[PDB]
Amino acid sequence: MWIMMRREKRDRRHFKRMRFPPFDDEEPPLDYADNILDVEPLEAIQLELDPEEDAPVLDWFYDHQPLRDSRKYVNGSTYQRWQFTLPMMSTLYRLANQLLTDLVDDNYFYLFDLKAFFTSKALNMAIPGGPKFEPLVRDINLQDEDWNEFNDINKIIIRQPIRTEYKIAFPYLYNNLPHHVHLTWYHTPNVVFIKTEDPDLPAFYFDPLINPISHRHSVKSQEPLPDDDEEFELPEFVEPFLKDTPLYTDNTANGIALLWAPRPFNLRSGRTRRALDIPLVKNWYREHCPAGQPVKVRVSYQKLLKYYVLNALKHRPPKAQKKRYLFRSFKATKFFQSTKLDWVEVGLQVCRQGYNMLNLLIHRKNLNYLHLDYNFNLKPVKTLTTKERKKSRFGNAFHLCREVLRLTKLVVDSHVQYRLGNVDAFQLADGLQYIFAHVGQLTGMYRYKYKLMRQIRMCKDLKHLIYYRFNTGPVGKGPGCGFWAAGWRVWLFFMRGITPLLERWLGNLLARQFEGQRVESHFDLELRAAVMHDILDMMPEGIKQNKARTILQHLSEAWRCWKANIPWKVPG
């Protein structure tokens, strides 16, 4: 997809960004039965596969769940623990060369490892390509260490300044107070690998990239050696172990080149991951630097790395659970049914369901001067008198729910536009990327939860990362990028974060029964209450219990006397 979306952006001199919202207002979403069901969908974005090379993946490459039926490759319909042959894996690796840096070792990540970033954070220091962090401990006084006879300038020889990366490589030599510091010097022997470029060549070839050995025989540095027919003879049976098998097959160069492939492509087999959990451009901002790119994407690189390092550092092991699935209990319940359905139908269904929910929440107190349209915009039917304006107000939770519903409605309507032939597949992808990269502009949800700015900025940073890698060479600048999966996942992690908050606020709101400077108030009232409770408890239950106020007054008088430092001795 990356290799082709760069071509239609180069082929289409101009590109038509799909309208947003792609649908009109005050108009309900189109019914699935009458329009979508009959219309034949347009062709999807797909690369024609060369049967001469890509044959191992030619049969199933663009399926919904590839090799789902093949019991040989996958375990079954649960779709976990796939097994892939080497031709298959080599073909996939060659096809994914546009999304894979050709780094064999990790020595290129000398001071851009996450351990070095942990060190930089714990030292309040920044690698030039690395992110900035707040100090772990302020230690401003420790920053203001006095001019002693130890750190005296006149005793110090300065030849080359002690740069930050020096103090990071050796955080126990060049600096002081190295708390919560990590070490990394993993200079793995730099693997000397020369990937083949000739389709036709011996797999074990002495390509000119290797300096010649230049074998010599000038000096008679002889060794114990025999002559011809000298007290030795070989049996006729004995031979080299492998004579029939060739020295190198056709799948030898691909197999060897597959050893030094990135992490996903050095596995013969492995478990299945979700679509959310695959960061495609993860190995892009992890790179050392952008090669001569402007400031607004350099800062994007540091801001991506900052969040990456923050997540790596703040990571915790998942807590032990009991595995109570949610939809499984729904299937157990008599109130739900299962059915295979088209996704676009599901979106048009959920948009109506959420619109009905929000209209019910609006008409919960029977205030007819607030109206929700089909684009999830809450508008007054008439200019609001102040009493009615204040009377019809909703907390941040309702607005957040409405705005996330607007986001999902925008996505669903874009897909409907694709299905109705209103836009092209390229146009659909570009529109989806614009939605997932400009949620703030399209939906004002950040005005109802400030933390969203992070995600907002995160997505924009991702855009910059992909664009500068997308608009390269003859591509030019324009709205021709549809690499939406980079920023698409972020709003889903935001979704899993906010799901219980809304599922709790709505539950409190949509229920039969509704529910909705403290230490100095703690030990005064509670202590006095406990004292009075005990005294009245052991005090006899007779008519004498009229003396409760007397006991309280005695307590107050004793407290006053201690406060007034005056002798207090009640005689009786």
């Binding site: 101009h14 590109f15 840096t101 030039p128 300044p161 990239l209 800062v299 990362l465 890698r469 060479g473």
Partner: protein, 122 residues
Amino acid sequence: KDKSKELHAIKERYLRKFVFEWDASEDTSIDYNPLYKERHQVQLLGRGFIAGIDLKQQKREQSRFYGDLMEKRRTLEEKEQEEARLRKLRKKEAKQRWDDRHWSQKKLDEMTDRDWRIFRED
């Protein structure tokens, strides 16, 4: 200007508003010395290329140092296949350069339905 900057750095060491665009003050790549201002980009034996950047753009942008090294070391007996593979590549991406062509020099018979949509969009 490197000297004054590095001496200044030595002296440093030893002595409501919903904005989405970041600030330029969070940039950290600023360097006072050349060895980190201009890092030697990994040529990666010339056969390895950065992921996001296009391939042939890197090839023509490359320092060509390994190109001339190969020109020096390669012998005539194994240059024929190099020339043949290079010309075959040039031909096979020339297929894409000519078959997949902009409508500005595609005639009506050459112009296809996809090219028709390209022209109408324009």
